[PDB]
Amino acid sequence: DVNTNIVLGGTTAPAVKGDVNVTSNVQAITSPQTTTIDNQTGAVTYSNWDGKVNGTVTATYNGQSYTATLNETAGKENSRVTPWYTQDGGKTWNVLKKDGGVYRLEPAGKYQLSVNNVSFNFGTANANKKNITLTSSNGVQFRENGQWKDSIKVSTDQNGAVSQPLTLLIPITPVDVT
Amino acid sequence: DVNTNIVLGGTTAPAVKGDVNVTSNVQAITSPQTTTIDNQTGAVTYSNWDGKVNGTVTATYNGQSYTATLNETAGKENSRVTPWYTQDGGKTWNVLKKDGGVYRLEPAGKYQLSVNNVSFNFGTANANKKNITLTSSNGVQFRENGQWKDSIKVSTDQNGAVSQPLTLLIPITPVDVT
Secondary structure: OOOOOOOOOOOOOOOOOOOEEEEEEEEEEEEEEEEEEEOOOOEEEEEEEEEEEEEEEEEEEOOEEEEOEOOOOOOOOOOOEEEEEOOOOOOOOEEOOOEOOEEOOOOOOOEEEEEEEEEOEOOHHHOOOOOEEEEEOOOOEEEEOOEEEOEEEEOEOOOOEEOOOEEEEEEEOOEEOO | OOOOOOOOOOOOOOOOOOOEEEEEEEEEEEEEEEEEEEOOOOEEEEEEEEEEEEEEEEEEEOOEEEEOEOOOOOOOOOOOOEEEEOOOOOOOOEEOOOEOOEOOOOOOOOEEEEEEEEEOEOOHHHOOOOOEEEEEOOOOEEEEOOEEEOEEEEOEOOOOEEOOOEEEEEEEOOEEOO
8 A cells, every 4th residue: 555644653654464363262261269248238358269261262364264273292392371460550461370279360450371382274275375464353462583563474384384383472351250 | 339228218229420510600699779777776677689690500521520501592592591489488489570670689598590591512522422411519400391300311412512402490599798
């Protein structure tokens, strides 16, 4: 697209993009293990939260919908799901240790999932392709050059698989019981 | 190497060995950035600690002393030094984050350093050797099969270098400098 338009930003490249439309279908759910109250009022208190999270990452590309592949082997190359939280406004981000042997995912609060060694099999139909550009539909980020990024370029190998392993950051906002 | 002696606790191989004897020469030192005082008692109070660590890992092998090599490359290959603390003790172990942009280490101690992609150059003289036993003389541990241990077996390549990257855990107990 020709750049015609005089935006005060200083004539940057356009935001027109997207070969592969990566979309998290990851969902998070939590329940309190212990609810308390003072009977002097009706002031309930839900506490001791117990989080769980499930789903997958799909990707629309050339009118076909693919699903991300994880690695179920036990080496350094295990696609390790690691939950991240911020006490700040995302100024920093710390890994959740297991407390009482569960992931305390407290309702609202902001979370992020990190999963390395992801892939996709786009099929022999899509072999040997260069500059496939991955964009997120819903706040998924891709790791590159030591830093998170809104989009990344991948090439497919002779079979149609992304030639090198990805690493994703997935947003999480739990639902709760009640 | 022959079992004569009836110890309680089954009978098991001896622990004595060490083809190559690794020693941490890592030292840690800290100062409070603010020293304060309760004049009604005269009880001083140190706070805002500022830790620094320095040193090397050496190793004795076949009468010669070698020194560990780190990897400088910007990337996934980089020997990442990560400071490491246990809250109270044992099962707890978490990454030490920078506060006030510096690594506060309190002289009460209980810290460990973790460093990947280490190596050694044992010299052309020690090429092509097949199974070498690594031991520490001062509490350095080596990573394998997802867990630390005090010994590992490695082989040298055509040049005399450890064929594969090591990953170490180094103890440190800081000292207070006035």
